[PDB]
Amino acid sequence: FENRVAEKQKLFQEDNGLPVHLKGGATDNILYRVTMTLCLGGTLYSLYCLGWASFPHK
Amino acid sequence: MAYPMQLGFQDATSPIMEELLHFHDHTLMIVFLISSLVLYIISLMLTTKLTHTSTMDAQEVETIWTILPAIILILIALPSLRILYMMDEINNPSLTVKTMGHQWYWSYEYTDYEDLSFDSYMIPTSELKPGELRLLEVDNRVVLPMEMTIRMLVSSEDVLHSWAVPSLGLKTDAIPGRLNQTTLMSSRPGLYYGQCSEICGSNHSFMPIVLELVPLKYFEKWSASML
Amino acid sequence: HQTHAYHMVNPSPWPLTGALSALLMTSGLTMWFHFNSMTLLMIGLTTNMLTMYQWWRDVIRESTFQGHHTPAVQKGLRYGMILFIISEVLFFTGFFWAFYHSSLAPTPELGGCWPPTGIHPLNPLEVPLLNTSVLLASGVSITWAHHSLMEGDRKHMLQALFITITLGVYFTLLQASEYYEAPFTISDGVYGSTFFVATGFHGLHVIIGSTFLIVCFFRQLKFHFTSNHHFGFEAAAWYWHFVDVVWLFLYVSIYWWGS
Amino acid sequence: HETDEEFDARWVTYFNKPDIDAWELRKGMNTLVGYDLVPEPKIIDAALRACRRLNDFASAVRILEVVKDKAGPHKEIYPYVIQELRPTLNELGISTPEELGLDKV
Amino acid sequence: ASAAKGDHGGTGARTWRFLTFGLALPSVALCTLNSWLHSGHRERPAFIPYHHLRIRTKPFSWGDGNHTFFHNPRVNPLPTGYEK
Amino acid sequence: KIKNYQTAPFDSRFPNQNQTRNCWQNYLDFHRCEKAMTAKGGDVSVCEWYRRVYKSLCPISWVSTWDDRRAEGTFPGKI
Amino acid sequence: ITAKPAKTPTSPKEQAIGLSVTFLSFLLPAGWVLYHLDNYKKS
Amino acid sequence: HYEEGPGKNIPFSVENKWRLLAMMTLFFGSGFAAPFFIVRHQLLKK
Amino acid sequence: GDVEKGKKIFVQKCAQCHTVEKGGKHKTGPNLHGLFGRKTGQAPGFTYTDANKNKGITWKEETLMEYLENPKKYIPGTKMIFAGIKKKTEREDLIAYLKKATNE
Amino acid sequence: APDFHDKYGNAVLASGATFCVAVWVYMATQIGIEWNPSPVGRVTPKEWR
Amino acid sequence: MFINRWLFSTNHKDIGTLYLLFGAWAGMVGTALSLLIRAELGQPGTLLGDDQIYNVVVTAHAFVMIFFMVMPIMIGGFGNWLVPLMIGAPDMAFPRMNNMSFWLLPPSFLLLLASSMVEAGAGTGWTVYPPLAGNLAHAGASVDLTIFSLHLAGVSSILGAINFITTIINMKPPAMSQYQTPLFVWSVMITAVLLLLSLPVLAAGITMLLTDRNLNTTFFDPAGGGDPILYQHLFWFFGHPEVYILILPGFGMISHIVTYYSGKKEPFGYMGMVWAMMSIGFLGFIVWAHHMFTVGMDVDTRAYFTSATMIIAIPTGVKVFSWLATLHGGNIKWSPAMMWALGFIFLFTVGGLTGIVLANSSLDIVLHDTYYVVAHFHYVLSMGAVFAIMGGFVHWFPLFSGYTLNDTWAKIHFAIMFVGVNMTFFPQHFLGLSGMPRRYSDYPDAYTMWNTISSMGSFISLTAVMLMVFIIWEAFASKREVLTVDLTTTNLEWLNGCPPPYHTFEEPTYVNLK
Amino acid sequence: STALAKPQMRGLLARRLRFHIVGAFMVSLGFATFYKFAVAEKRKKAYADFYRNYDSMKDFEEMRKAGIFQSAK
Amino acid sequence: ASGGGVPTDEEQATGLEREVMLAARKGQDPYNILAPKATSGTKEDPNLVPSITNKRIVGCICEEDNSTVIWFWLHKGEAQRCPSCGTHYKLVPHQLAH
Amino acid sequence: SVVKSEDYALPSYVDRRDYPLPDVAHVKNLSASQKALKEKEKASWSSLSIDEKVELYRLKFKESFAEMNRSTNEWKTVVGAAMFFIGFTALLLIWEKHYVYGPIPHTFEEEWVAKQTKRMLDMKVAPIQGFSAKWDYDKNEWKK
Ligand code: HEA
Ligand SMILES: CCCCC/C=C\C/C=C/C/C=C\C/C=C\CCCC(=O)O[C@H](COC(=O)CCCCCCCCCCCCCCCCC)COP(=O)(O)OCCN
Ligand SMILES: CCCCCCCCCCO[C@@H]1O[C@H](CO)[C@@H](O[C@H]2O[C@H](CO)[C@@H](O)[C@H](O)[C@H]2O)[C@H](O)[C@H]1O
Ligand code: CUA
Ligand SMILES: [O-][O-]
Ligand SMILES: [Cu+2]
Ligand SMILES: [Mg+2]
Ligand code: NA
Ligand code: NA
Ligand SMILES: [Zn+2]
C-alpha cells in the first residue's frame, strides 16, 4: 500500500460547494439515492402494514 | 365505605387505621403550615415598591432554611416510622384466610379446618336489590370474626391485582407466584368495602371486596353452611 | 469565516435515514414476531447498515481528508465516547440486576435452589476459562497496537491489531459453539433467560467491537492515522476494554458464582 | 463593613471628582439606586453638581425623581431631601420634577 | 500485586509485544490445550418434563415454532422429550 | 395430642410480608417427613403438624399443582 | 420589551375571526365523534 | 444560504395571516382530533 | 345435580362465551342447544380447532365431567380459554343445569 | 390618549362576570346534572329489606 | 432548500424549533386524551366501554405528555435553542447527531399511535407492568409496539444526553468555569446525566419484557422462576430519576424568569442552586422503591425508602426559598411569564408537599393507587412542569420568532389555565383520601360530586389551550418586531437580536482570565 | 417655617422584612392550632368518646335485627 | 522490534487542524483556544480584544469567582467600559486571518 | 436614523425605575431650536424657562417616573375576559351533558337513595364522624 491521503485531502477540499456526503463523486449520489428510496419506500410499506393490521378481516 | 361529598379518610375500623388518621392530621397540619408560609412570603415579596437589586449575601439565611426543614422532616419521620414498625410487630392470629385475585373477581380460601373456598363477584347493577350499592356489593361476602387478629394472605392466579379495604387501613398487592401477608383486626361488626387497586385489565373497576364482620359463633355457623 | 475551533457540519441526510431505519427495524421486529414476515425487518437492517456506513465515512472525510478535528473537536469526541460507554455499562447493569435478583432468591418453581433443578451449568474451567484468556490476551495485544502506533511503527501496529481482531473472532466462534452445545436453552426458565440474554448482548457487543477494530485496521492500511492523531483507534480500544470488563463480570457472576 | 458615614463620604467623593465624565455619572447613579437606601442629601448634592459640570440639566431632574422613587411608600423622605437641597437647587437653577409638572401621570 | 514484572526505563511497544507473545498468547495456547483435553461429549441428561423448563408461552417466529434458535437435537429435548 | 389448632403460629424464620417460602417449606417438610416415615416403616401421623400449617398457609391451587407434579415425577424440590 | 408598530395590525374583527376558527377547529371534529358515540358502541 | 429574520426562520410561511390560520388550524386541529378518531376506530371494532 | 346452582356457575363462568337456547348466536364459543347424546364439534356454522372437530367423543354427563375439570388436558389444542372447575359437586350442578337448559 | 382598557375595561369586566355567573348557574341547575349531594339533613331514610 | 434546512438540519436553533413544533402538536394529542379520560369520569356510568379502551387512553395520555410533550419541549426545544447561546458556543458538540435525536421522535410517536390502532391497544398503565402487559393478558402487537416506541424515544434522549453533557463541558469560553454558566445550563446538564444513567436501565427492563413476550424468556414469569416485582424495580429505577428529569429544566427556566422579571442581574444564592440541583439529581437515584410500598417488601427497606425520599425536600426547599429571595427587593414586572413562574412556585410547592405525605410507607398503604397520588403528580406536572414551559415559552417566544405576543391575551390565558388546573386536580385529593382507585373508568356513586367538578375543570383548561393557539396566531398575524430587550448584560441569549442569525458566535465571545 | 425632621432613609426594605417575617410565621403557625384544635383534637376526642363505652355486641345485634348480614338473620 | 511508516501530524495534518497546529508553534492563538490574561484594565492599559470584524461580544467576570458574567458588544474604535466594574476593553485587529 | 439592522448590538434607551440614567439619550436627531437649546444649556440654568427645561428633559428621556409607573385598567380587561372564556366553557359543558352523556344510573333515583341511605345507616357507615355519626338513632332523625 502507498500513502494516498494527500490526494483525498485535495479531492475533499476542492472548492465546488458539495456537501461532504456527496463530495466523493457520482458513487456518493447513487448510494445516497439507494438509501433514501429504501427508507422512504420502507416507511410507506410500514404505513401500509399498519392499515392492514389495524382492522380485522377474519 | 365512602359517602357523598366526603373530604377525608373513611372512619377507622381498626386501631391501626385510627393511628394513620392522627398521623395524617399531624402531617397535613405541617403541610398547611409550610404551604401558607410560602404563599404569605411570596405575597410579602410582591407588595412593596422598595427595591434592593444589588448582590445579596446568601450564607446565613441559608442555614435556617436548610436546618428548619430537616427538623420538620424528623418530626414527620419519627411518628411515621413508629407506626410502620407497629404495623410490622408480631401478633399471633387466630385465623388465616387467603384471597386470590382473578380477572375479574376474588376467591377466598379458609382452610385452617375444612376445605372452604368460594368466588366473590360484583353484583351487576341490573341485579342490585333495592338500597344496595352500585359497583360495591358482591354475591359471596368475606365473612370474618370481629375483634380477632386475622392473618390475610394475598396472591393472584393471573395478572397483578391489589386487595384493599380503606376502613381497615389495608392494601396488599396480589402477585402471582407470591404470597403476601397482612393482618386484619376489626374493632366493630359490620360491612366494610374495598376495590381492586392494581390495574388488571377490562374489569379492574368491577371486582370489589366486601368484608362481613360478625361474632365468632356466627362466623362458625356460616362456615359450616358454606361447606 | 469562523474564529473558533469547532466543526460546523454540512447539512446531512443520515440522521433522517438513521431515524427511519429505526422505524423499519422496530416495525420489522413487530411484523416478524406477529405477522410471520421478515421484509420490513430486512429493509430496516439494510438502511441501518447503509446509514452507519455513510455517516462514519463522512466523519472520516471530515477529519482525515478535511482537517476539521482540531484538539477542541477531538476532546468533544473523547467525552462523547466515554458517556456512550457509560450508558452501555448501565444497560448491562440491568441484566446483572436481573441475574442476581433471580439467582439470590430462587423461587419454588425452580426447586427453591440455584442453579434450578434440571439445569446442568457449563464448567467455568472449560471453554469459559478459555474465552476469558482470549479476551484478556486481546487486551494485551490491543495495547501493543496502541504503542506501536504512537511510536510510528506501521507494521507492528497492523500485526498487533490483526492479532486483537483474530482473538475477538476466536471468542465469537467459541461462544457460537458453546451456544450450540449448551444442554439448556433460552426457554429453560430464568436460568436460560438471564444466561442467553446477558451473554448474547455481550456477544453482540463483541461483534460490534471487532467490526470497529476491522474498520481501524483498514483505515491504518490506508495511512489515515498519524502517530499523534488516531481517535477512531482509541475509541475502538476503550470500547474493546469495556467489552473485556463486562465479560469478566459475566464470567465471575454467571459462570462461576452462579454455577 | 464600613460606617454609614464612610459609605456616604466615598459616594460624595465619587461625584465631586472635577472631571467626572458622563459614563461615570450614569454608572454611579444607576449603581447607587440598587442599594437598600435613599441617598443622603450630601450625596445627591454632589451628583447634581456633577450634572452641572457635565452641562446636563435633564439628568439632574431625573436624579430627583429617582430619590422620590427609592423612598417607596415612605412619603416623608422626598420632601425632607428637597428641603435640604433647596440652597443647591436655587444656586444651580435646578427645577424639581414637580415644578416642571413631570410628577403628573 | 506486580506479578513478577519490570520496566519504566524505556519504550512501550516493545514491552507490550513481549507481554503479547510471552504471556498472553502462551496463556491462550495452554487454555486451548486444556479444552482440547478435558472435553468430549457429556452424556445427555435424561428427560423429565419439568414445568419451569422448555417454556412455550408463544411459538418462536422461525421453524415450526417449537425449536430454540441454536437447537441441538443431541442435548436439547423438546417439551415432549428428545426428538429423532 | 396438641390440637386446639386455631391457625399456623408466627414462625420467626418467616417474619416478613412475603410468606411464599413459609408455605413452601412446610409443604416440603410434610412430604419429606411422610416419605421418610414410609421408607423407615415408621409412623406418618408425626407429619400431621406440617400438613396443618401448609394447608393453612398455601393457596389451594399451589398445593394441587405441586401434588400433580409429585405424581407426575416433575416436582422440582427435593423430597 | 419594546416592539415596532405591527407590520400587518390584526383588528378586533380579524381577531374574532382567528379566535372563532381556532375554537371550531378543536371543537367540531371531537364534537362530531362524541355526538356519534352510541353508533359505534353498536358493537 | 437561507433566509434570516422574523418570519424566515421557520418551516411554515407567515406571509399571509389567513393562509397561516388555515395551516395552524390543520396542524393543531389534527393533533387534537387524532385521539377522538382512534377511540372511535377502537369502538367500531367490537 | 342442582340445576339453579348450575345456572349461577354457567352465568358467572360460561355465559360470556356461550349461549344455551335453540336459536342463540355463536359468541367467542359455539351455541350449546342439543349438546348431550351428541358428538363433539358439530354445532352448525362454528369454526372449531381440529382438536375439537376431531376429538371423537360423545357429550353426556360422564364426558362433560372430565372435560370441564380441565378443558385443554382433555382437548389439547383447544381454543376454549378456561382453566376448569375443580369441585366435583360444582361440575355435577353445572352439568345438571346444562342437561335441562340445552334442550328447551 | 385612553387605551383599550380605559375605554372598555369596565364593560369587559361587568359583562364577562355577568355572563360567567348566568351560564354556570344555568349549567349547574337547569339541565339535570347529578351532583349527588349528601343525604344528611335532606333524605328521609326508607325501609329497603 | 427546504429539505436541506428542515430535514437535514445541523443547526441548533432550527432543531430546537422542530422540537417545539413537535412538542406543541404532541401537547394537543395529550390534551385530547386528558379530556377523554375526564369525559369518561365526568358522570357516573360507562361512557366509552370497559376499562380496556379507557386505559388505552390513560396509558397514551401519560406517554404522550411525558415523552412527546414535556421532554421534547424542555430539553430538545429550550435546551437546543438556549444552551449554545447561553455559553457563546457556535452550535452543539454533535450537530448532526442532534438532528437524529429529533427525527427519532416522529417514528417513536407513530409506533405509539400504531399500538392503539391494532388489536385492542396497550391498556397497561404507562408503567407497563407484567403479567397484564405480557403475552397472555395482552396478546398481539400492541404492547410490543409500545416497547419499541419507548426504545426509540430512549435512544433519542440518550444520544441527546451525550450531546448536551459534551456541549456544556467542552464548549464554554475557555475562561468560563462551570461556576460561571447560567442555572438553566446547569439544569440541562444535570438532567442529561440523569437520562444517561436511567434510560439504559429502562431499556434493559422493557427488552426483558419484549423477550418474555416473544422469545419465551421468563424474567417476569413465576412459572420459569421469574418475578413480576423485578420488572417494577427496573422500571422505577428509571422512573423516579425520570420525574426529576421532567422538572429540573423547569427549575432552570424558573430561576431565569424570576431573576429577569425581578429586575435582578442574578438569582439569589447561585452556588446553593447548583448544589440543590446536584443533590436532587443524586438523591433521585436512591428512592425508587417508594413506588412499591404495597408490593410486600421488608419493613427495614420500607423505613429506608421513606427516610431517603423525604430528604429530597431539603435541597428542593433551598431552591424555593432562593426563588423567594430573588423576588425580594426586585423591581417586579408583572409580565405573563412572571405570572407563570409565581404560580409554579406555589403550586409546585403544594405538589412537592403531598409527595412528602406519600413518602411515608405507612400512610401510603392507604393512598397508593388512589387519586391522592394523581393529585400529587398533576400538581408537580400539570402545574409545575407545564407552568415552567408556558413561562419559558412566553418569555422566549420573541427571541425565537422576532415577534412579540399580546401580553393582555397572555395574562388572560394564564388566568383561565390557573382556574382550570386547580378545579381539575384539587378535588382529586378528597377522592384519593376517601378511597377512589386509579385507572378506573367508573366509581361508586359516593364519588360523583368531586369527579363531576374535576371534569368541569378539565374543560376550562381546554379553553385555555385553544386560546393559546389563537395567541400564537395573533403574534404571527400582527408581526410586531422586537425593538429593545432589557437586561441583555446578564442574558446573553438575547444579545444577537431577535431572532438571532442562523450562525451565531462564528467569532466567539472574549472572556479574560484576569 | 419649621424644618421637616430627618427621617429614616437606610435599610427600608430590610426593616420591612424584619417586621413582617414575624407575622408570616405567626399567621402560618398562626393557623397553628387551628387545624390542630379544630380538626385533630376534635378527632382524637371523637374516637375516644365513641369507644369509651362502646358495646360491640349491642352494635352487632342492632345490625342483625336490621337484616344487613348474610351470615346472621 | 521496529521500523516506521506511520505519518506524522507535521506531514499529514490539513485544514483547520493544521492551522491551529502551525499557529500553536508560533505561540499564536487565532482560533481562541486559550483564555486571554487580563491587563490592568485602565483607560491607559485597556484589555485588547482581537476581532476579525467591527464588534465582538465581551464577557466580564468582574471579580474572580463571580458566578455572574457581564456581557456586552465591544465596538471598533475608542475603548469601552464594563457596565458593572468599569474595566476597559479595546477592539484590535484579528491578525486571525493568520 | 439609518440605524435599523446592526442595531441590536448598539447601546439603547430604556425607561426603568432601577436604571434612571440610560445609556443613550431618548431623542436621536435634533432640530435647529433643540440644538440652540443644548447650547443655551451650557449657560446658567436659571436663564432657562420652564418650557425649555421640560424640553431638555424630553430630549433625554421618553417618560417621566410618574408616567412609566402609572397604574392601568388592564386588570379589568384580563379578569372580565377570563370570566367570559370560563363562561364560554360552561356552554361546552352544557352541550356535553345534552349530547354526550346518557342516563345516569338508576341508583341515583330518589327512591333508591332513600332506601340506600337507610341501609347505610343500618350498617352504621362511618358511625364515628363521617355519616351515621350525623344520625340520631334515639330520635330517629338527622342530628340538628
Ligand atoms: C414533576 C414530576 C414529579 C416530581 C418533581 C415529584 C417529586 C416528589 N414526589 Fe412524586 N410522582 C410523580 C411525579 C413527581 N413527583 C409521578 C408521575 C408519580 C406517579 C408515578 C405513577 O405511579 O404513575 C409520582 C409518585 C410518587 C410517589 C409514589 C406514591 C404512590 O404511588 O403510592 C411518592 C412517594 O413517596 C412520591 C413522592 C415525591 C416526593 C417526596 C417528591 C419530592 O421531590 C418533592 C420535594 C418538594 C417539596 C417538599 C416542596 C418544596 C420544599 C419546601 C418548601 C421546603 C420545606 C418542606 C418540608 C419541610 C416538607 N411521588
Ligand atoms: C454467537 C454469539 C453472538 C450473539 C448474537 C446471535 C444471534 C441473535 C441476535 C443477537 C441479539 C442480542 C440479544 C437479543 C436477545 C436474545 C438473543 C440471545 C443470544 C442468543 O443467540 O440466544 C440463543 C437463542 O436465541 C434467540 O432466541 C435468537 C432470536 C433473535 C431475536 C432478536 C430480538 C431482538 C431484541 C431487540 C433488541 C432491542 C435492543 C434495545 C436497544 C437499546 C435501547 C437504548 C441461544 O440459543 P438456544 O437454542 O435458545 O440455546 C442454545 C441451546 N443449544
Ligand atoms: C371533549 C372536548 C370536546 C368538546 C366538544 C364540544 C363542543 C361541541 C361543538 C359542536 O360539535 C358539533 O355538534 C353538532 C350537534 O350540536 C353535531 O351535529 C350533530 O347534531 C346536529 C343536530 O342535532 C345534527 O344536525 C348533525 O347532523 C349531527 O352530526 C356536529 O357533528 C358536531 O361537530
Ligand atoms: Cu383486579 Cu384491578
Ligand atoms: O416520583 O416522585
Ligand atoms: Cu418517585
Ligand atoms: Mg399499585
Ligand atoms: Na493515542
Ligand atoms: Na365512566
Ligand atoms: Zn466587569
Side-chain angles (χ1 to χ4, degrees), chain G residues 25-26 29-31 33-34 37 40, chain H residues 27-43, chain K residues 25-37 48 53-54 56-58 60-62 64-65 109 112-113 116-117:
Chain G
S25 67
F26 280 71
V33 169
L34 256 8
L37 278 180
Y40 336 128
Chain H
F27 188 64
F28 293 114
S30 67
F32 194 76
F36 299 89
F37 283 88
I38 296 158
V39 167
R40 170 175 183 274
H41 171 71
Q42 284 286 345
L43 298 174
Chain K
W25 196 82
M28 299 311 98
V29 174
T31 295
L33 288 154
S34 79
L35 295 157
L36 283 161
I37 296 170
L48 300 171
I53 185 173
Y54 176 68
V56 164
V57 170
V58 168
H61 160 70
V64 170
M65 293 298 208
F109 205 160
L112 175 157
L113 305 156
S116 72
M117 286 290 291

Side-chain angles (χ1 to χ4, degrees), chain C residues 29 32-33 91 172 175-176 179-187 196-197 199-201 203-204 207, chain E residues 60 62 68-72 75-76, chain K residues 148 151 154-155 158 199-200 203 207 210-211 215:
Chain C
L29 286 172
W32 180 47
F33 289 160
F91 182 63
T172 295
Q175 204 62 310
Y179 269 23
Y180 187 72
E181 305 297 330
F184 50 93
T185 76
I186 192 170
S187 63
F196 291 105
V197 176
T199 64
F201 270 109
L204 175 61
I207 289 158
Chain E
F60 295 114
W62 56 80
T68 68
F69 203 89
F70 287 81
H71 176 77
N72 179 349
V75 300
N76 307 132
Chain K
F148 287 136
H151 276 142
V155 176
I158 287 159
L199 285 169
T207 298
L210 180 83
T211 65
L215 295 187

Side-chain angles (χ1 to χ4, degrees), chain C residues 75-91 231 235 238-239 242, chain K residues 93-94 97 157-170 189 192-198 200:
Chain C
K75 191 171 188 196
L77 284 171
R78 296 184 179 272
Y79 287 123
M81 189 71 193
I82 287 168
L83 292 165
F84 176 73
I85 286 168
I86 282 165
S87 81
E88 291 256 59
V89 160
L90 271 294
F91 182 63
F231 184 62
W238 298 351
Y239 194 77
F242 149 71
Chain K
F94 310 126
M97 192 171 77
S157 289
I158 287 159
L159 298 179
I162 292 170
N163 219 325
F164 276 105
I165 300 163
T166 298
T167 300
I168 293 160
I169 295 316
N170 191 48
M189 178 149 66
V193 176
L194 267 56
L195 285 161
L196 188 78
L197 305 183
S198 68

Side-chain angles (χ1 to χ4, degrees), chain B residues 162 171 173 197-199, chain K residues 129 232 291 294-295 368-369 439:
Chain B
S162 180
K171 170 171 312 110
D173 290 354
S197 291
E198 186 80 37
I199 178 176
Chain K
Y129 284 6
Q232 304 185 16
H291 298 277
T294 70
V295 315
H368 180 63
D369 247 292
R439 298 148 169 182

